């Protein structure tokens, strides 16, 4: 099966899709070539849960029925240059309150 | 141009709906005019009696919001084969956003409501374009 | 896979693949690698990144299609994006 994910530095976010059984290592390896960071340098987060690099993407909860196109599931990402830094994901806009004639 | 060969030749047919809308499935009579027939709920199929050469074509039945049957816009049941059943497969077509964003909308605003929004007059007139079939029909007879 | 940059209205960095946002015309007129979008939000922005996902995947699609979901608190403001972007 295909999933569809958001992965999710501060500003910077990354659209893109894989299999179920692709890696999270394989994940990593994506974010390299577009933010030129190697993969030892990245730590990949399920709601601040860390991610094991050797579990597929369908054992970390990212189905079919979860990562879809039109609601693609959040993957945050970490950078280390002593230590990893604490995951900061800055948050989308706030839509504003419904007109009167929308409730 | 649009309505059924009375051919008065029957067919087996299966309407699937394969989409989240509750569906309204409209024959083309034998004067071409639309003739509504029972809604299917959501995800439900039921198999009905109709004839070949026959037309139909599927709606939102609460919006006439315009849906798609085996990939195309038009239904001809053809000559049962084998005794199997023929499959009119019906799903969402992949709506523009501006026309998705349209339905939303509508589905929200009461119509009156629509000149009462911020939006430029030109959107306020493509809120006001309810899909119509019979608009639809006639914009289709045309080359 | 060439990727795109499509900045928002507050300076989120929305990185996608660039034959996902050619699905805009007025996208592929732009371009034909960053964009910059000054009057679009990135609650907004988001939601049209995810139509482009959902329009290369579906349209010509076998497959039963599902629903393009728009929340209530975001219809106004993403169907004047629609608009200005061609899809
Ligand atoms: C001879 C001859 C007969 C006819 C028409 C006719 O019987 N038709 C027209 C279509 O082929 C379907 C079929 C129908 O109406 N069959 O009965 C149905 C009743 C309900 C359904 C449906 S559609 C969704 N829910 C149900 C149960 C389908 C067919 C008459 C209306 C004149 O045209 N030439």
Redesign the pocket.
Same mark, same amino acid.
């Given at each position: 099966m295909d999933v569809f994910l958001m992965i999710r530095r501060h500003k910077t976010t990354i659209f893109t899709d894989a299999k179920e059984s692709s890696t999270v290592f394989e994940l990593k390896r994506i974010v390299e070539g577009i933010l030129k960071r190697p993969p030892d340098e990245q730590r990949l987060y399920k709601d601040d849960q860390l991610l094991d690099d050797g579990k597929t993407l369908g054992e970390c909860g990212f189905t079919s029925q979860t990562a879809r196109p039109q609601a693609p599931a959040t993957v945050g990402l970490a950078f280390r240059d002593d230590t990893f830094e604490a995951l900061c994901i800055e948050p989308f806009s706030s839509p504003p309150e419904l007109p009167d004639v929308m409730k | 141009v649009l309505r059924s060969v009375?051919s &008065?030749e029957p067919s087996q047919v299966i309407?699937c709906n394969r989409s989240p809308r509750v569906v309204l #499935?409209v024959?083309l009579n034998f004067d071409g005019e639309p003739q509504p /027939? #029972?809604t299917?709920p959501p995800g439900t199929g &039921?198999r009905? $009696?109709? /004839?070949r050469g $026959?037309l139909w074509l599927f709606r939102d039945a609460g919006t006439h919001d315009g849906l798609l049957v085996n990939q195309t816009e038009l239904f001809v049941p053809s000559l049962n084969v084998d005794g199997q059943p023929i499959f009119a497969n019906i799903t969402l077509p992949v709506y523009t956003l501006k026309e998705r964003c349209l339905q939303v909308v509508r589905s929200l605003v009461k119509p009156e409501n629509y000149r009462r929004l911020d939006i430029v007059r030109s959107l306020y007139e493509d809120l006001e374009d309810h899909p119509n079939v019979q608009k639809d029909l006639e914009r289709l007879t045309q080359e | 896979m060439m990727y795109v940059k499509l900045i928002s209205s507050d300076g989120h960095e929305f990185i996608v693949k660039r034959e996902h946002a050619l699905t805009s015309g007025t996208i592929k007129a732009m371009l034909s690698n960053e964009v910059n979008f000054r009057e679009i939000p990135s609650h907004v922005l988001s939601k049209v990144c995810m139509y482009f996902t959902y329009k290369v995947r579906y349209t010509n699609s076998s497959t039963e299609i599902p629903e393009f979901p728009i929340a209530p608190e975001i219809a106004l403001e993403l169907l004047m994006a629609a608009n200005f972007l061609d899809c």
């Amino acid at each position: 099966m295909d999933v569809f994910l958001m992965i999710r530095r501060h500003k910077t976010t990354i659209f893109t899709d894989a299999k179920e059984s692709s890696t999270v290592f394989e994940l990593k390896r994506i974010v390299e070539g577009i933010l030129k960071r190697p993969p030892d340098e990245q730590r990949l987060y399920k709601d601040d849960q860390l991610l094991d690099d050797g579990k597929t993407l369908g054992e970390c909860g990212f189905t079919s029925q979860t990562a879809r196109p039109q609601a693609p599931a959040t993957v945050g990402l970490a950078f280390r240059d002593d230590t990893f830094e604490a995951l900061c994901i800055e948050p989308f806009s706030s839509p504003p309150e419904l007109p009167d004639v929308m409730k | 141009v649009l309505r059924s060969v009375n051919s &008065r030749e029957p067919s087996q047919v299966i309407f699937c709906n394969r989409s989240p809308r509750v569906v309204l #499935p409209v024959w083309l009579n034998f004067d071409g005019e639309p003739q509504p /027939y #029972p809604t299917l709920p959501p995800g439900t199929g &039921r198999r009905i $009696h109709s /004839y070949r050469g $026959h037309l139909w074509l599927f709606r939102d039945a609460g919006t006439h919001d315009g849906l798609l049957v085996n990939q195309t816009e038009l239904f001809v049941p053809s000559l049962n084969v084998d005794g199997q059943p023929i499959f009119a497969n019906i799903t969402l077509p992949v709506y523009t956003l501006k026309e998705r964003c349209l339905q939303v909308v509508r589905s929200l605003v009461k119509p009156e409501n629509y000149r009462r929004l911020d939006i430029v007059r030109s959107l306020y007139e493509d809120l006001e374009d309810h899909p119509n079939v019979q608009k639809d029909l006639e914009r289709l007879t045309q080359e | 896979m060439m990727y795109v940059k499509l900045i928002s209205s507050d300076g989120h960095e929305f990185i996608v693949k660039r034959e996902h946002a050619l699905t805009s015309g007025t996208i592929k007129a732009m371009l034909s690698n960053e964009v910059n979008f000054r009057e679009i939000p990135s609650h907004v922005l988001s939601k049209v990144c995810m139509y482009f996902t959902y329009k290369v995947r579906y349209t010509n699609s076998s497959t039963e299609i599902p629903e393009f979901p728009i929340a209530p608190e975001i219809a106004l403001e993403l169907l004047m994006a629609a608009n200005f972007l061609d899809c």
